[PDB]
Amino acid sequence: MKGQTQRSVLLCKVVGACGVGKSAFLQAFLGRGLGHQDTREQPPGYAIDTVQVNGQEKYLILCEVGTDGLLATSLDATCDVACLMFDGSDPKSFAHCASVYKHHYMDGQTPCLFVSSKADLPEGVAVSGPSPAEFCRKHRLPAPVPFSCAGPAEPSTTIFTQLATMAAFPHLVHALHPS
Ligand SMILES: Nc1nc2c(ncn2[C@@H]2O[C@H](COP(=O)(O)OP(=O)(O)O)[C@@H](O)[C@H]2O)c(=O)[nH]1
Ligand SMILES: [Mg+2]
């Protein structure tokens, strides 16, 4: 039917440098913010839970993948959607994240979502250009999504529905004129 897919299980790789918040992001997928985390439920570097996509229950696997040092080149990029994470409070974070995209995903068919982590902290701009938003406009990616794991409030679930939807229907992801 329209809006349905044979896929029951979707794979997202959460790809980013050490310290950008990948492990906390996986915990937030399971409904746990900073401190409220709980390690002994799922394997390290993995988080699985159900996500609704157009009324249908899907399983989304988040798979944590580092990019520090040699990992920036020694990357198995295969996944249904790549979540490219950079530290929104770190001036130097985005450039490394953008380089990973260019070398592994830029001219592929895998949907990519840039995520600006630690949105609760004071923002950290880079000295050179371009901005993360300008980079995504040029390479025709979605606008980078800010995310935060802190606060006493429950973590938002919107970005995980977005990742699951991109994974389920990879041909309807885009940047678009007119809107
Ligand atoms: N303020 C804040 N700190 C965060 C957030 N996410 C992660 N951190 C902290 O940043 C550090 C690295 O996070 P971690 O999840 O281990 O990153 P990883 O190395 O990419 O897996 C830890 O001290 C976290 O508590 C966030 O949204 N806000
Ligand atoms: Mg980690």
Numbering used by the authors: 408 to 582, 584 to 587
Show sentences the authors wrote.
Human Miro1 and Miro2 (hMiro1, hMiro2, also called RhoT1 and RhoT2) are MOM protein homologs that play a critical role in mitochondrial trafficking38394041424344. Both associate with Parkin upon mitochondrial depolarization and are ubiquitinated on multiple lysines18374546. Here, we demonstrate that the cGTPase domain is necessary and sufficient for efficient ubiquitination of either hMiro1 or hMiro2 by p-S65 Parkin. We also find that despite considerable similarities between these two substrates, Parkin modifies hMiro1 much more robustly than hMiro2.
